[PDB]
Amino acid sequence: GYSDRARSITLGNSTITTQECANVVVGYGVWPDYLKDSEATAEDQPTQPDVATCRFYTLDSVQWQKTSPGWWWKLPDALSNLGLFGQNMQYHYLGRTGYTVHVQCNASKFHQGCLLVVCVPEAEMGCATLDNTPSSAELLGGDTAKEFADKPVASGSNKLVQRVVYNAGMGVGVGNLTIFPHQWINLRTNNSATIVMPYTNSVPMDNMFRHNNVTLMVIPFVPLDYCPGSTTYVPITVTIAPMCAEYNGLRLAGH
Amino acid sequence: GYSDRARSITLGNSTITTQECANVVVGYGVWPDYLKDSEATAEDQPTQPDVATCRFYTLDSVQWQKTSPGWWWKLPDALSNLGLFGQNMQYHYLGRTGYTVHVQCNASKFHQGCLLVVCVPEAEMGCATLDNTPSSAELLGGDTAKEFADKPVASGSNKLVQRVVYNAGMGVGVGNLTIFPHQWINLRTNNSATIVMPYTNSVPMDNMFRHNNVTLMVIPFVPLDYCPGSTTYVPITVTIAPMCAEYNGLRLAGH
Amino acid sequence: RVADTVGTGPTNSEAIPALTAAETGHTSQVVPGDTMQTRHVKNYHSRSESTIENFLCRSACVYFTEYKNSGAKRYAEWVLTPRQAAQLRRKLEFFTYVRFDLELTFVITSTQQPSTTQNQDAQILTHQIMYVPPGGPVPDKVDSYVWQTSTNPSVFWTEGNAPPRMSIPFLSIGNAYSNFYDGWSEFSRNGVYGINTLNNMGTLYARHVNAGSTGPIKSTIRIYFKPKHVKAWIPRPPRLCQYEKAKNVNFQPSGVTTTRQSITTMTNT
Amino acid sequence: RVADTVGTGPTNSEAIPALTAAETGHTSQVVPGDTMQTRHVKNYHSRSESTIENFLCRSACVYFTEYKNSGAKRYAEWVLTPRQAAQLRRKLEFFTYVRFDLELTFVITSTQQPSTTQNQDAQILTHQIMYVPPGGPVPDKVDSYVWQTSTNPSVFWTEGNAPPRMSIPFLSIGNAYSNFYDGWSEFSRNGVYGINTLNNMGTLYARHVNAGSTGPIKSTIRIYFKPKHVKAWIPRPPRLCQYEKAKNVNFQPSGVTTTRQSITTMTNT
């Protein structure tokens, strides 16, 4: 209907409308749907959270500086605090999810900059120490944005993650991250990215409080830039919504 | 129609008629035609020079002495000066051509002599120095006839071509050159040779200002001979006409 | 069999198949015809030697160990992983999930070791390569009851014949081998990182059956893997920076490209 | 199956199938019947063992190199060209363009080298012949990562068995291999002359897998080429003067024929 600048994604109670943007990028060509009986490995009865764990959970906003390295938020561990998603993953052994990762950032028409919004499934990060693994408090968020750096993280005995924008903390060239579903938030025109992740794993259902199946990375390829004066604080706000959640094996609260 | 002494080849504007000669020798059995889509390697759109690059370009005349070694003219590099053929090969990366090589030489009926007119595709000449390659200014013409010699070219550090009539500057016996399409210009009777070359290469189209697909060689097997007096200057004039020219990849002027 | 070009000609209408935002995460398909005019060109080129399987199905050496026939280490041991050779590893790490069968070929070659032993004469060493499934028994001394191969597969190969070959089917707890695992094995998120039990096909031990020559002989078992019946899902960036560890993705930061001169130079340094 | 003669008889009409100018570049076909009379003779002779393929499809040795199993040159290297042997080369240079598949057979034979080393005993050397496609990696030290044969084909051959054989298909950028190239690779017409990239199937390296005997052993890899599925276009004169270089047609002038006595002598000198 008319212009494609408009979009409106209603999931449950919360709606995200955007005045101006572009197309929604759908997964690898699959939209998250429930797991059928010919893939169901669980023998127990699953719950149906429906609309009450499919609302757009608005994670922490982070401020984009004129020159800023980039950010990443793990996916089952950014929602391990918010709402009933954070409950269910803890009371249930197995969980299965899809996402609507919607990154929204506005800017004036005198500002320029360009974010790459990718969603890397299975981002296994390296480490500054070449024989130690990361910690679980540097590697993961807490719904907070972890940010990289533009200089190598110095080696020692530290278990801090290796964080360099250009290697993406994985040891792959940053410019090749575009294979994975993504979109760009070029501030010239297009002010949001919508990436619909379908459930991707080697097993049909997996624990979410020990395994992080998706990692969102928002990397500015063209630094934010403008003239003197104006506004100097253009945040990037992430709204993520679980989609087609399904759990099994009703244990008890844990870690 | 009547006598076969007559022939008349009209290509575009220029016509070559000959009062007396013999049959036209057609290629290997193929007459040059345009390259079809099942051979077209180029993805670009080719030009059609038509009649304006299909006229008989009359190259340099050379004087046949009583005893003279022989001559050769490279084919895409004898026409790299004359007319629009010399332009097109320089503005276009790829080119494809056929030829009508018509060697004309007249003589009186008190003169004798006999030329072999062959067209050697891919004449890769040796060198006087047995470890150096030829130069590009001795090896090639400039539309001028390069002539061989009857004594071996002395070795040194020189990059001058090895030129001996009897080895044809290739290291093959001169008497075996007749496989290739040819004709004889026996001055007794028959005063021209017409050899219709079709495009011959391993690739469908190739640059012409770096590769010379045909080499015309005119070798006198029976020296010109006559009695004292009369005329003493029987030239050999070469008229070559491109046939079914086609170019691609409209670059800019080069070498 | 690839696609073909077709005749076009001039264009002056509002079509502009060129101009289109690439900000939408959509990689547009533009043919020659759109930016110029190109006649009908038939292409017979074949995009076969580029299939996922054919790419991965090439035997690559994953490892090799040495074992003296008379001394200390009379047996070698290897936990099966393709993560010991850079070459094969980088090909597998071009996909997040892969599923395949393996063909294990072992190229065992013996070399005499310098010694002052008198009258050294070999009587054709016979080698035993034994596969021990994950959670099997573990041999120590080379004479242990473990080497009886009661249920454990083994190839017995007499030297000077076609190299031993055996197949392994797809053995994974899951439904695909994970080439990248983000997660721990422990619920408290400590310990090993991405050392998940899905790509751990037990151990493979090898030893000399006989006592060979009187003198010492050292043999070199070279292991070859060849992926048959491959299915690969989720493509991902090839590794840039060099590998550092055989179970981690640890790396030292390095260049983004090979450097040259200016932005307008036409020749690589 | 060749043609047959048929009865003729006297001829007194204006036919003269003999007299005809050969100045027109037309090689006339004259039978026995035209210059005499010959009755009907049936010929069952067969012009098969003269076909283009059968002519060229004979295995010819193109080269051989040597490599010590313990010392310096532990590997040999060869840029594939048929231009290293006079015999095969002259047959190929009877055609301007040829297209074919290759069958590479390697006849590796080992010879012990004299030494004062004590108790030299071989344990069946295994040789590796590896094909490196054009623009591949180049091994240096014989232990380089290059020899992992990650994608590069290799034949592993244990000594004392049928010699290794492998096929190569037709690999050419163009649509035929050029046996004679008149042109340069450089647009300024300098540098190499007729060193075109169409007959350059990379390099082939070979080495000893094992450490063989305690003493030195030198092995000799002999390479055999055999053209299958041959198609040959544009015939041309066979080479007269001897070859001088493996990439040029350089020559020293020599005789046009072997000499004899007079023009009317009936016996060769």
Place this chain on the structure above:
Amino acid sequence: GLPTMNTPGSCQFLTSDDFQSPSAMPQYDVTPEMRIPGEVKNLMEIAEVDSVVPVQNVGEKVNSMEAYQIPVRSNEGSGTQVFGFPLQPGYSSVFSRTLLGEILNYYTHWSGSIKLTFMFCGSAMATGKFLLAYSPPGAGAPTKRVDAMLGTHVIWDVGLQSSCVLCIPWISQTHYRFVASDEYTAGGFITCWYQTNIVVPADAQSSCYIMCFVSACNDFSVRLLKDTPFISQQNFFQ
């Protein structure tokens, strides 16, 4: 007895063979099959996706996010060169680490068109026109816009749809080309020139950026597999 004579070719192991085999544990029941999203069945699925080209290089414009951005600025004289690199993927130090080029280094041959999408990431009021030209090998790269015109060019007029695809068509004298450097075949020169200088109003930054993306076309094929040179190891990973 069935008479047979072993042809030479037997008793060898190739590193690219394919045959029947004896099994290990026989009758093993393989796990089921899941239809996990994003199945790959051909390398051309991966090769036809855009990847950012790190066109800029200096010596520290190859260790940051400065590599991927191509500096564009308003210069009063028009005919200035924006960038320039040869098209010779899998050898050129501009495409040596891109997604297309990295797949290409496992192959010796390649054929097909290549798409260079240039995306203007300037201000939203900045304008400019660029003459993106590809000049086939026939001479040694233009040094003026007046020479670049003669080639196959596309004038890109900016203003909404912040990308414009200059599609480089197949111009070669052969049905394949080498990935590794050769001089029998070459790939010409890709240059960009200002057609009409970057006009930027007040309060808008006068230095913008362009991004270059490399992708394969659908008329693309690679042939003859070899193994990469851009990966290495010394001792085994312990």
Place this chain on the structure above:
Amino acid sequence: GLPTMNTPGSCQFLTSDDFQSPSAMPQYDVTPEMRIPGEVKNLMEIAEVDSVVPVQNVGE
């Protein structure tokens, strides 16, 4: 097992043999075919062409 007894003739390499073979890179797609002029299919095509005989010989 299919009983066979190797007849003598096996385990040799002739220089004029002809057999099936294992391929190198499998599934390689050979380049197209052009109908380049002057195809040769028999040596009698070449042998039935005139060549000048150097009948005279002396020493120069």
Place this chain on the structure above:
Amino acid sequence: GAQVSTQKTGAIHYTNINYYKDAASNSANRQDFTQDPGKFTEPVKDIMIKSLPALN
């Protein structure tokens, strides 16, 4: 039964009979030609048609 299929030709027939009990011991499926770039390329919800601009 004997499965007969054309050899991979550029521009014929080989018998092949599986001889082993398992189906994990059969020769590789080198021939298996399929292409479907509507996945990673153009993953968008509503396909952009090449005749107008993607955005309004």
Place this chain on the structure above:
Amino acid sequence: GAQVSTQKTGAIHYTNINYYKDAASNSANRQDFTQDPGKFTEPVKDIMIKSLPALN
């Protein structure tokens, strides 16, 4: 299928079955008999008929 063809006799039958995936690994085409000397011999435009002189 099995291709049966006569052995090259002077003046019978052999089974041959291609066993390899590629068609570049099949045995040579030793039998392939054709002759057509209307090429290099007599390449003239208008064929000279043997009953009169070529020239007038």
